[PDB]
Amino acid sequence: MGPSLDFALSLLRRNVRQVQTDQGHFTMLGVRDRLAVLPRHSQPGKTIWIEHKLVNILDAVELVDEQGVNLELTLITLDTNEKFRDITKFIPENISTASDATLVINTEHMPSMFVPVGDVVQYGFLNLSGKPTHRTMMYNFPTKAGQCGGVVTSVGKVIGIHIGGNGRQGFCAGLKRSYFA
């Protein structure tokens, strides 16, 4: 098996988890220690269902930029037994585009699912169901409901978290390493 498949399957084993909130099914990315990230609209509460058990949430942070604009990412500290494998080194230091990225999804409904979104380009502002959002990127792929939280990856780099689409295109919140320092 080659390196790209190996890397994505290793994410799925160690960092990319099937979850459920009151809003439904999402992919969760565990980044390090007991810190994970989810799309803001998943609206995690005091507890979250992770794979096979209810986990308590000790803290949630909704990220906004200096202008007070939604970034569509919530950082959760979990009451988990184990630390996540630390993947902050794979998250670029600034929001980065990519070529021929793969969207990796892991939900009870869409388990271990690989979506060939293709090139990922700068997009910036995005009106997400009436919510103004910054620091997004775009792929010309018809992504669908249930894919939010999906991890946008390319060549060993973890660069986005899927957050929406319009039936022709998909958008992610961009990831940068400072979010998890």
Which residue in 49, 41, 58 sits closest to 145, CA to CA?
Answer: 41
Q: Which is nearer to ligand AG7, 147 or 154 (CB)?
A: 147
Considering the complex, state which of residue 30 and residue 164 has its C-beta at the smaller distance from ligand AG7.
164
Q: Does 129 bind ligand AG7 (CB under 6 A)?
A: yes
Please tell me whether residue 128 binds ligand AG7 under the rule CB under 6 A.
yes
Contact status, residue 179 vs residue 73, Cβ threshold 8 Å:
yes
User: For this structure, is 72 an active site residue?
Assistant: yes
Check 25, 134, 148, 172 and give the catalytic one. Answer: 148
- Tokens 């994410």 correspond to 11
Among 164, 173, 174, 175, binds ligand AG7 (CB under 6 A): 164
Across 13-156, the runs of DSSP E, i.e. the strands, are 16-21, 24-32, 35-39, 47-50, 53-64, 70-78, 98-105, 113-128, 131-139, 151-154
Reply yes or no on whether 172 is catalytic: no
12 phi and psi, to 5 degrees?
A: -55, -35
How close are the terminal C-alpha atoms of the chain, in Å? 33
Cβ closest to ligand AG7, residue 85 vs residue 131: 131
166 lines the binding site for ligand AG7 (CB under 6 A): yes
Tell me: does residue 170 bind ligand AG7 (CB under 6 A): yes
Radius of gyration over every alpha carbon of the chain, rounded to an integer in angstroms: 15
Catalytic site includes residue 93 = no
* Residue with the CB atom nearest ligand AG7 in the bound state: 164
- Selecting among 72, 134, 162, 172, the annotated active-site residue is 72
Using DSSP's 3-state secondary structure scheme, residue 9 falls into helix
What are the residues binding ligand AG7 (CB under 6 A)?
Answer: 41, 126-129, 131, 143-148, 163-166, 170
Residues recognised as catalytic: 41, 72, 148
